[PDB]
mmCIF file of all heavy atoms in Angstrom:
data_model
loop_
_atom_site.group_PDB
_atom_site.id
_atom_site.type_symbol
_atom_site.label_atom_id
_atom_site.label_comp_id
_atom_site.label_asym_id
_atom_site.label_seq_id
_atom_site.Cartn_x
_atom_site.Cartn_y
_atom_site.Cartn_z
ATOM 1 N N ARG A 128 2.037 -1.775 -0.909
ATOM 2 C CA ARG A 128 1.440 -2.467 0.213
ATOM 3 C C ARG A 128 1.955 -3.864 0.369
ATOM 4 O O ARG A 128 2.096 -4.598 -0.619
ATOM 5 C CB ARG A 128 -0.063 -2.512 0.048
ATOM 6 C CG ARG A 128 -0.658 -1.137 0.198
ATOM 7 C CD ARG A 128 -2.087 -1.148 -0.099
ATOM 8 N NE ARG A 128 -2.833 -0.236 0.726
ATOM 9 C CZ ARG A 128 -3.990 0.330 0.385
ATOM 10 N NH1 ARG A 128 -4.520 0.147 -0.804
ATOM 11 N NH2 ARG A 128 -4.653 1.065 1.284
ATOM 12 N N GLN A 160 4.401 -0.250 2.873
ATOM 13 C CA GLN A 160 3.479 0.056 3.927
ATOM 14 C C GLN A 160 2.601 -1.108 4.260
ATOM 15 O O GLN A 160 2.133 -1.837 3.407
ATOM 16 C CB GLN A 160 2.611 1.283 3.616
ATOM 17 C CG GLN A 160 1.753 1.088 2.493
ATOM 18 C CD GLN A 160 0.895 2.319 2.176
ATOM 19 O OE1 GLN A 160 1.257 3.445 2.478
ATOM 20 N NE2 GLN A 160 -0.216 2.079 1.519
ATOM 21 N N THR A 161 2.306 -1.186 5.544
ATOM 22 C CA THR A 161 1.471 -2.222 6.081
ATOM 23 C C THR A 161 0.533 -1.570 7.111
ATOM 24 O O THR A 161 0.906 -0.588 7.754
ATOM 25 C CB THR A 161 2.334 -3.336 6.712
ATOM 26 O OG1 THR A 161 1.596 -4.539 6.778
ATOM 27 C CG2 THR A 161 2.821 -2.959 8.158
ATOM 28 N N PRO A 162 -0.694 -2.106 7.267
ATOM 29 C CA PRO A 162 -1.565 -1.467 8.240
ATOM 30 C C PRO A 162 -1.056 -1.607 9.666
ATOM 31 O O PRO A 162 -0.566 -2.670 10.071
ATOM 32 C CB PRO A 162 -2.884 -2.231 8.086
ATOM 33 C CG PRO A 162 -2.790 -2.828 6.689
ATOM 34 C CD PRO A 162 -1.384 -3.227 6.601
ATOM 35 N N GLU A 163 -1.169 -0.529 10.431
ATOM 36 C CA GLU A 163 -0.813 -0.569 11.842
ATOM 37 C C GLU A 163 -1.454 -1.742 12.559
ATOM 38 O O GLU A 163 -0.803 -2.386 13.367
ATOM 39 C CB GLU A 163 -1.258 0.713 12.526
ATOM 40 C CG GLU A 163 -0.744 0.801 13.937
ATOM 41 C CD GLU A 163 -1.308 1.968 14.683
ATOM 42 O OE1 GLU A 163 -2.265 2.547 14.171
ATOM 43 O OE2 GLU A 163 -0.812 2.270 15.792
ATOM 44 N N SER A 164 -2.724 -2.005 12.263
ATOM 45 C CA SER A 164 -3.493 -3.029 12.967
ATOM 46 C C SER A 164 -2.828 -4.391 12.851
ATOM 47 O O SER A 164 -2.891 -5.191 13.756
ATOM 48 C CB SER A 164 -4.918 -3.130 12.412
ATOM 49 O OG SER A 164 -4.926 -3.496 11.030
ATOM 50 N N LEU A 189 3.759 2.472 8.255
ATOM 51 C CA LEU A 189 2.458 2.037 8.678
ATOM 52 C C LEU A 189 1.361 2.869 8.032
ATOM 53 O O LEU A 189 1.454 4.106 7.986
ATOM 54 C CB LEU A 189 2.345 2.184 10.186
ATOM 55 C CG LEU A 189 3.362 1.427 11.004
ATOM 56 C CD1 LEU A 189 3.234 1.724 12.515
ATOM 57 C CD2 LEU A 189 3.243 -0.081 10.662
ATOM 58 N N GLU A 190 0.348 2.201 7.502
ATOM 59 C CA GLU A 190 -0.837 2.936 7.087
ATOM 60 C C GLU A 190 -1.953 2.678 8.086
ATOM 61 O O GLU A 190 -1.817 1.850 9.002
ATOM 62 C CB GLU A 190 -1.237 2.624 5.650
ATOM 63 C CG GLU A 190 -1.567 1.186 5.410
ATOM 64 C CD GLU A 190 -2.108 0.975 4.018
ATOM 65 O OE1 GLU A 190 -2.985 1.771 3.581
ATOM 66 O OE2 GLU A 190 -1.639 0.026 3.337
ATOM 67 N N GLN A 191 -3.026 3.450 7.950
ATOM 68 C CA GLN A 191 -4.145 3.386 8.889
ATOM 69 C C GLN A 191 -3.643 3.615 10.329
ATOM 70 O O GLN A 191 -4.110 2.960 11.281
ATOM 71 C CB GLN A 191 -4.915 2.064 8.728
ATOM 72 C CG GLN A 191 -5.525 1.871 7.338
ATOM 73 C CD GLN A 191 -5.551 0.416 6.839
ATOM 74 O OE1 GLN A 191 -5.201 0.159 5.698
ATOM 75 N NE2 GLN A 191 -5.949 -0.520 7.685
ATOM 76 N N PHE A 192 -2.722 4.562 10.475
ATOM 77 C CA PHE A 192 -2.085 4.804 11.749
ATOM 78 C C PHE A 192 -3.000 5.706 12.566
ATOM 79 O O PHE A 192 -3.512 6.701 12.064
ATOM 80 C CB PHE A 192 -0.694 5.400 11.551
ATOM 81 C CG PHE A 192 0.089 5.523 12.815
ATOM 82 C CD1 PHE A 192 0.821 4.449 13.297
ATOM 83 C CD2 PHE A 192 0.041 6.677 13.544
ATOM 84 C CE1 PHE A 192 1.532 4.574 14.480
ATOM 85 C CE2 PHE A 192 0.729 6.798 14.727
ATOM 86 C CZ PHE A 192 1.459 5.753 15.194
ATOM 87 N N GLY A 193 -3.198 5.317 13.818
ATOM 88 C CA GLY A 193 -4.125 5.982 14.701
ATOM 89 C C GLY A 193 -3.446 6.930 15.641
ATOM 90 O O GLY A 193 -2.218 7.103 15.621
ATOM 91 N N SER A 194 -4.264 7.530 16.508
ATOM 92 C CA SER A 194 -3.793 8.614 17.350
ATOM 93 C C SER A 194 -3.966 8.289 18.849
ATOM 94 O O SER A 194 -3.768 9.153 19.711
ATOM 95 C CB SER A 194 -4.564 9.896 16.983
ATOM 96 O OG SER A 194 -5.932 9.672 17.115
ATOM 97 N N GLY A 195 -4.311 7.034 19.140
ATOM 98 C CA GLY A 195 -4.396 6.537 20.512
ATOM 99 C C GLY A 195 -3.036 6.333 21.147
ATOM 100 O O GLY A 195 -2.004 6.212 20.483
ATOM 101 N N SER A 198 -0.980 3.538 19.766
ATOM 102 C CA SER A 198 -0.152 3.919 18.634
ATOM 103 C C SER A 198 1.119 4.532 19.090
ATOM 104 O O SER A 198 2.149 4.246 18.538
ATOM 105 C CB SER A 198 -0.884 4.848 17.649
ATOM 106 O OG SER A 198 -1.966 4.168 17.025
ATOM 107 N N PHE A 209 7.854 5.919 8.061
ATOM 108 C CA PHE A 209 6.705 6.787 7.816
ATOM 109 C C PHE A 209 5.444 6.236 8.411
ATOM 110 O O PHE A 209 5.287 5.018 8.642
ATOM 111 C CB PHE A 209 6.527 7.044 6.302
ATOM 112 C CG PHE A 209 6.222 5.807 5.497
ATOM 113 C CD1 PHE A 209 4.904 5.410 5.295
ATOM 114 C CD2 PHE A 209 7.229 5.020 4.991
ATOM 115 C CE1 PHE A 209 4.622 4.274 4.590
ATOM 116 C CE2 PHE A 209 6.941 3.871 4.244
ATOM 117 C CZ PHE A 209 5.649 3.499 4.048
ATOM 118 N N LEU A 210 4.533 7.159 8.669
ATOM 119 C CA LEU A 210 3.194 6.875 9.155
ATOM 120 C C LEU A 210 2.186 7.512 8.220
ATOM 121 O O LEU A 210 2.291 8.722 7.943
ATOM 122 C CB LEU A 210 3.011 7.506 10.526
ATOM 123 C CG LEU A 210 3.938 6.949 11.617
ATOM 124 C CD1 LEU A 210 3.672 7.632 12.956
ATOM 125 C CD2 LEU A 210 3.779 5.494 11.717
ATOM 126 N N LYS A 211 1.197 6.752 7.788
ATOM 127 C CA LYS A 211 0.094 7.303 7.075
ATOM 128 C C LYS A 211 -1.119 7.246 7.969
ATOM 129 O O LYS A 211 -1.523 6.180 8.426
ATOM 130 C CB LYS A 211 -0.160 6.550 5.808
ATOM 131 C CG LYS A 211 -1.215 7.189 4.958
ATOM 132 C CD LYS A 211 -1.370 6.433 3.655
ATOM 133 C CE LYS A 211 -0.026 6.208 2.940
ATOM 134 N NZ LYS A 211 -0.252 5.821 1.559
ATOM 135 N N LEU A 212 -1.656 8.422 8.242
ATOM 136 C CA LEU A 212 -2.703 8.590 9.210
ATOM 137 C C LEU A 212 -3.964 7.931 8.714
ATOM 138 O O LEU A 212 -4.274 7.963 7.513
ATOM 139 C CB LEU A 212 -2.960 10.081 9.411
ATOM 140 C CG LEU A 212 -1.732 10.910 9.795
ATOM 141 C CD1 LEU A 212 -1.929 12.412 9.628
ATOM 142 C CD2 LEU A 212 -1.372 10.607 11.246
ATOM 143 N N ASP A 213 -4.703 7.344 9.645
ATOM 144 C CA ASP A 213 -5.948 6.769 9.328
ATOM 145 C C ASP A 213 -6.935 7.846 8.900
ATOM 146 O O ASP A 213 -6.953 8.927 9.430
ATOM 147 C CB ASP A 213 -6.520 6.037 10.509
ATOM 148 C CG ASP A 213 -7.760 5.265 10.106
ATOM 149 O OD1 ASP A 213 -7.606 4.204 9.493
ATOM 150 O OD2 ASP A 213 -8.857 5.759 10.350
ATOM 151 N N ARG A 214 -7.737 7.512 7.907
ATOM 152 C CA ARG A 214 -8.708 8.416 7.397
ATOM 153 C C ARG A 214 -9.681 8.905 8.454
ATOM 154 O O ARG A 214 -10.257 9.956 8.301
ATOM 155 C CB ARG A 214 -9.478 7.745 6.285
ATOM 156 C CG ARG A 214 -10.116 8.695 5.381
ATOM 157 C CD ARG A 214 -11.036 7.934 4.461
ATOM 158 N NE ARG A 214 -11.538 8.820 3.445
ATOM 159 C CZ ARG A 214 -12.147 8.417 2.352
ATOM 160 N NH1 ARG A 214 -12.287 7.130 2.097
ATOM 161 N NH2 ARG A 214 -12.591 9.315 1.512
ATOM 162 N N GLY A 215 -9.886 8.124 9.494
ATOM 163 C CA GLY A 215 -10.738 8.527 10.620
ATOM 164 C C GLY A 215 -10.208 9.750 11.317
ATOM 165 O O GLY A 215 -10.976 10.551 11.862
ATOM 166 N N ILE A 216 -8.907 9.954 11.243
ATOM 167 C CA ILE A 216 -8.307 11.180 11.782
ATOM 168 C C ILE A 216 -8.323 12.329 10.819
ATOM 169 O O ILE A 216 -8.425 13.501 11.220
ATOM 170 C CB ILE A 216 -6.794 10.990 12.117
ATOM 171 C CG1 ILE A 216 -6.579 9.931 13.170
ATOM 172 C CG2 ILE A 216 -6.201 12.328 12.592
ATOM 173 C CD1 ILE A 216 -5.101 9.709 13.434
ATOM 174 N N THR A 217 -8.155 12.041 9.544
ATOM 175 C CA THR A 217 -7.793 13.069 8.582
ATOM 176 C C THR A 217 -8.970 13.599 7.768
ATOM 177 O O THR A 217 -8.933 14.734 7.294
ATOM 178 C CB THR A 217 -6.702 12.550 7.641
ATOM 179 O OG1 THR A 217 -7.196 11.438 6.890
ATOM 180 C CG2 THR A 217 -5.489 12.122 8.471
ATOM 181 N N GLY A 218 -10.005 12.780 7.616
ATOM 182 C CA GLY A 218 -11.135 13.088 6.766
ATOM 183 C C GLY A 218 -11.759 14.449 7.058
ATOM 184 O O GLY A 218 -12.101 15.178 6.119
ATOM 185 N N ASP A 219 -11.890 14.798 8.341
ATOM 186 C CA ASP A 219 -12.527 16.066 8.723
ATOM 187 C C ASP A 219 -11.538 17.068 9.274
ATOM 188 O O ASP A 219 -11.893 17.904 10.123
ATOM 189 C CB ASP A 219 -13.635 15.812 9.737
ATOM 190 C CG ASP A 219 -13.150 15.026 10.935
ATOM 191 O OD1 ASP A 219 -11.926 14.728 10.993
ATOM 192 O OD2 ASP A 219 -13.997 14.687 11.801
ATOM 193 N N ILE A 220 -10.289 17.011 8.805
ATOM 194 C CA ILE A 220 -9.261 17.869 9.356
ATOM 195 C C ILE A 220 -9.591 19.345 9.263
ATOM 196 O O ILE A 220 -9.272 20.110 10.168
ATOM 197 C CB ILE A 220 -7.885 17.655 8.690
ATOM 198 C CG1 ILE A 220 -6.806 18.401 9.482
ATOM 199 C CG2 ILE A 220 -7.919 18.069 7.170
ATOM 200 C CD1 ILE A 220 -5.373 18.323 8.915
ATOM 201 N N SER A 226 -9.674 16.286 15.304
ATOM 202 C CA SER A 226 -8.797 15.744 14.265
ATOM 203 C C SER A 226 -7.499 16.533 14.137
ATOM 204 O O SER A 226 -6.411 15.963 14.053
ATOM 205 C CB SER A 226 -9.557 15.684 12.952
ATOM 206 O OG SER A 226 -10.630 14.781 13.173
ATOM 207 N N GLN A 227 -7.617 17.847 14.148
ATOM 208 C CA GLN A 227 -6.449 18.713 14.146
ATOM 209 C C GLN A 227 -5.534 18.401 15.311
ATOM 210 O O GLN A 227 -4.301 18.337 15.147
ATOM 211 C CB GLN A 227 -6.892 20.171 14.187
ATOM 212 C CG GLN A 227 -7.631 20.566 12.909
ATOM 213 C CD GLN A 227 -8.406 21.855 13.045
ATOM 214 O OE1 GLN A 227 -8.202 22.600 13.990
ATOM 215 N NE2 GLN A 227 -9.276 22.142 12.067
ATOM 216 N N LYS A 229 -5.379 15.539 16.996
ATOM 217 C CA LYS A 229 -4.849 14.161 16.814
ATOM 218 C C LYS A 229 -3.664 14.207 15.908
ATOM 219 O O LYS A 229 -2.633 13.572 16.134
ATOM 220 C CB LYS A 229 -5.911 13.260 16.193
ATOM 221 C CG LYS A 229 -7.032 12.930 17.136
ATOM 222 C CD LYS A 229 -8.135 12.132 16.472
ATOM 223 C CE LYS A 229 -9.322 11.916 17.430
ATOM 224 N NZ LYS A 229 -10.365 11.103 16.727
ATOM 225 N N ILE A 230 -3.808 14.973 14.835
ATOM 226 C CA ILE A 230 -2.742 15.037 13.891
ATOM 227 C C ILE A 230 -1.507 15.700 14.528
ATOM 228 O O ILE A 230 -0.394 15.189 14.351
ATOM 229 C CB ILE A 230 -3.177 15.744 12.607
ATOM 230 C CG1 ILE A 230 -4.251 14.895 11.936
ATOM 231 C CG2 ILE A 230 -1.951 16.037 11.725
ATOM 232 C CD1 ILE A 230 -4.900 15.592 10.721
ATOM 233 N N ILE A 233 0.479 13.501 16.682
ATOM 234 C CA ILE A 233 1.296 12.552 15.933
ATOM 235 C C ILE A 233 2.475 13.257 15.331
ATOM 236 O O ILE A 233 3.610 12.808 15.487
ATOM 237 C CB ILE A 233 0.482 11.808 14.863
ATOM 238 C CG1 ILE A 233 -0.563 10.902 15.566
ATOM 239 C CG2 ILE A 233 1.432 11.065 13.938
ATOM 240 C CD1 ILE A 233 -1.648 10.435 14.688
ATOM 241 N N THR A 244 5.260 11.767 8.039
ATOM 242 C CA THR A 244 3.824 11.613 8.192
ATOM 243 C C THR A 244 3.121 11.852 6.866
ATOM 244 O O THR A 244 3.563 12.653 6.052
ATOM 245 C CB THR A 244 3.252 12.521 9.250
ATOM 246 O OG1 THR A 244 3.553 13.899 8.936
ATOM 247 C CG2 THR A 244 3.794 12.139 10.627
ATOM 248 N N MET A 245 2.028 11.134 6.669
ATOM 249 C CA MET A 245 1.316 11.126 5.415
ATOM 250 C C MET A 245 -0.176 11.103 5.659
ATOM 251 O O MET A 245 -0.628 10.561 6.648
ATOM 252 C CB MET A 245 1.722 9.874 4.643
ATOM 253 C CG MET A 245 3.221 9.674 4.629
ATOM 254 S SD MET A 245 3.658 8.277 3.573
ATOM 255 C CE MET A 245 3.406 9.090 1.999
ATOM 256 N N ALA A 246 -0.934 11.718 4.765
ATOM 257 C CA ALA A 246 -2.374 11.678 4.854
ATOM 258 C C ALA A 246 -2.857 11.270 3.486
ATOM 259 O O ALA A 246 -2.245 11.605 2.453
ATOM 260 C CB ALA A 246 -2.930 13.036 5.222
ATOM 261 N N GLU A 247 -3.968 10.578 3.482
ATOM 262 C CA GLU A 247 -4.574 10.144 2.249
ATOM 263 C C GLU A 247 -6.027 10.530 2.164
ATOM 264 O O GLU A 247 -6.593 11.084 3.089
ATOM 265 C CB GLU A 247 -4.347 8.644 2.036
ATOM 266 C CG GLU A 247 -4.842 7.773 3.147
ATOM 267 C CD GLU A 247 -4.728 6.272 2.840
ATOM 268 O OE1 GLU A 247 -4.359 5.875 1.684
ATOM 269 O OE2 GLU A 247 -4.978 5.493 3.800
ATOM 270 N N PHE A 248 -6.610 10.209 1.026
ATOM 271 C CA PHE A 248 -7.980 10.553 0.660
ATOM 272 C C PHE A 248 -8.210 12.037 0.741
ATOM 273 O O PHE A 248 -9.300 12.492 1.103
ATOM 274 C CB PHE A 248 -8.979 9.811 1.483
ATOM 275 C CG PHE A 248 -8.889 8.332 1.322
ATOM 276 C CD1 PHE A 248 -8.321 7.540 2.314
ATOM 277 C CD2 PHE A 248 -9.366 7.727 0.169
ATOM 278 C CE1 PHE A 248 -8.242 6.157 2.163
ATOM 279 C CE2 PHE A 248 -9.309 6.353 0.022
ATOM 280 C CZ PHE A 248 -8.754 5.563 1.032
ATOM 281 N N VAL A 249 -7.175 12.803 0.413
ATOM 282 C CA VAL A 249 -7.281 14.248 0.500
ATOM 283 C C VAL A 249 -8.140 14.684 -0.667
ATOM 284 O O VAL A 249 -7.812 14.444 -1.853
ATOM 285 C CB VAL A 249 -5.897 14.934 0.489
ATOM 286 C CG1 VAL A 249 -6.078 16.453 0.504
ATOM 287 C CG2 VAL A 249 -5.040 14.436 1.663
ATOM 288 N N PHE A 258 -3.317 20.052 6.409
ATOM 289 C CA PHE A 258 -2.223 19.065 6.611
ATOM 290 C C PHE A 258 -0.881 19.770 6.577
ATOM 291 O O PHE A 258 -0.003 19.462 7.371
ATOM 292 C CB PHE A 258 -2.252 17.946 5.568
ATOM 293 C CG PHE A 258 -3.453 17.085 5.670
ATOM 294 C CD1 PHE A 258 -4.320 16.959 4.601
ATOM 295 C CD2 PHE A 258 -3.748 16.399 6.857
ATOM 296 C CE1 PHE A 258 -5.449 16.193 4.706
ATOM 297 C CE2 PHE A 258 -4.868 15.646 6.939
ATOM 298 C CZ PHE A 258 -5.721 15.553 5.866
ATOM 299 N N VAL A 263 2.227 17.836 8.348
ATOM 300 C CA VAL A 263 2.197 16.540 7.665
ATOM 301 C C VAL A 263 3.106 16.621 6.427
ATOM 302 O O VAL A 263 3.028 17.582 5.678
ATOM 303 C CB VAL A 263 0.766 16.144 7.305
ATOM 304 C CG1 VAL A 263 0.744 14.863 6.446
ATOM 305 C CG2 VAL A 263 0.001 15.886 8.573
ATOM 306 N N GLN A 267 -1.958 12.571 -0.379
ATOM 307 C CA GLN A 267 -2.398 11.918 -1.597
ATOM 308 C C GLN A 267 -3.899 11.870 -1.571
ATOM 309 O O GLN A 267 -4.511 12.005 -0.505
ATOM 310 C CB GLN A 267 -1.825 10.503 -1.715
ATOM 311 C CG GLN A 267 -2.421 9.527 -0.734
ATOM 312 C CD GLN A 267 -1.643 8.256 -0.641
ATOM 313 O OE1 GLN A 267 -0.817 8.106 0.244
ATOM 314 N NE2 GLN A 267 -1.897 7.328 -1.554
#
Side-chain angles (χ1 to χ4, degrees):
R128 291 174 145 154
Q160 64 181 26
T161 202
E163 188 187 13
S164 61
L189 302 176
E190 61 173 314
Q191 299 146 225
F192 187 85
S194 57
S198 294
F209 63 90
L210 297 181
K211 186 177 309 196
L212 305 165
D213 188 77
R214 202 189 188 166
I216 299 177
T217 63
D219 54 3
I220 190 182
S226 297
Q227 294 164 14
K229 289 175 185 181
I230 295 173
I233 294 163
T244 58
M245 313 185 75
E247 57 174 354
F248 299 105
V249 177
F258 294 121
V263 174
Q267 71 193 96

